[PDB]
């Protein structure tokens, strides 16, 4: 509703999502390159009945970094909230997990944050 | 406080810490190889007057991965709680940040967890 649409991060990535009435999020995440080889499926969930008192709307989504052209044997999940208004934003923290051997599991998961806006 | 002494994780690392009356934690972290080249200083802080309802003791500490023999240009912090009793343990989550250029800052921080016990 306020979430459905196109969102941009500061590094040049784009994600297009449809927020379904049933709490589904579906869309595409497109890397900086903007290439067909830079497009990945995303799927997630969001709170479809949020508080109406200024609170954000909790949401999360996952991208697995495999498409018909490349595979990075990893997956990112973003967890955060949508905050509406004239300066609407989605504030997230993310976890990027790479497939590793049991021994190398200590370097499997990177952590970071992303802020998405409706304007680039 | 219960914390002073030697603690072991399941990967084979050791840490020797002294808990001071004022809340300081000082000690040495020794990676699994066990030699002088695997020794690193640690410093941190802990709640020196924890709650008495059975709650754990909050604490945290940092190791910068440089000694006189090697420099990994990184630092790890462990954030967690001591749980006393016969089977004492320290439950932690850790962040390991490596020094990177700005362009590679996305891969600067790993996250994981460790549990430390008094027996190997």
């Amino acid at each position: 509703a306020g979430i459905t649409g196109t969102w941009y991060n500061q590094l040049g990535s784009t994600f297009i999502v449809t927020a379904g009435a049933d709490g589904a999020l579906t869309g595409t995440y497109i890397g900086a390159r903007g290439n067909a080889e830079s497009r990945y499926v995303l799927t997630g969930r969001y709170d479809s009945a949020p508080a109406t008192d200024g609170s954000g709307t909790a949401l999360g989504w996952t991208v697995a970094w495999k498409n018909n052209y490349r595979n990075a044997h990893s997956a990112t999940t973003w967890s955060g909230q949508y905050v509406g208004g004239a300066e609407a934003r989605i504030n997230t923290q993310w976890l990027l997990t790479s497939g590793t051997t049991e021994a190398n599991a200590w370097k499997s998961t990177l952590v970071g944050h992303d802020t998405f806006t409706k304007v680039k | 406080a219960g914390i002073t002494g030697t603690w072991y994780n399941q990967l084979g690392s050791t840490f020797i810490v002294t808990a001071g009356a004022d809340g300081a934690l000082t000690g040495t972290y020794i990676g699994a190889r066990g030699n002088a080249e695997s020794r690193y200083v640690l410093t941190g802080r802990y709640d020196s007057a924890p709650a008495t309802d059975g709650s754990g003791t909050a604490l945290g500490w940092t190791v910068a991965w440089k000694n006189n023999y090697r420099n990994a240009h990184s630092a790890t912090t462990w954030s967690g709680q001591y749980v006393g009793g016969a089977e004492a343990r320290i439950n932690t989550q850790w962040l390991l940040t490596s020094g990177t250029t700005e362009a590679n800052a996305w891969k600067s921080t790993l996250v994981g967890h460790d549990t430390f016990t008094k027996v190997k």
Binding site: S13, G31, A32, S38, W65, R70, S74, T76, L96 | -
Partner: peptide, 6 residues
């Protein structure tokens, strides 16, 4: 990595 590709 594709999440951070320029």
């Amino acid at each position: 990595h594709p999440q951070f590709e320029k």
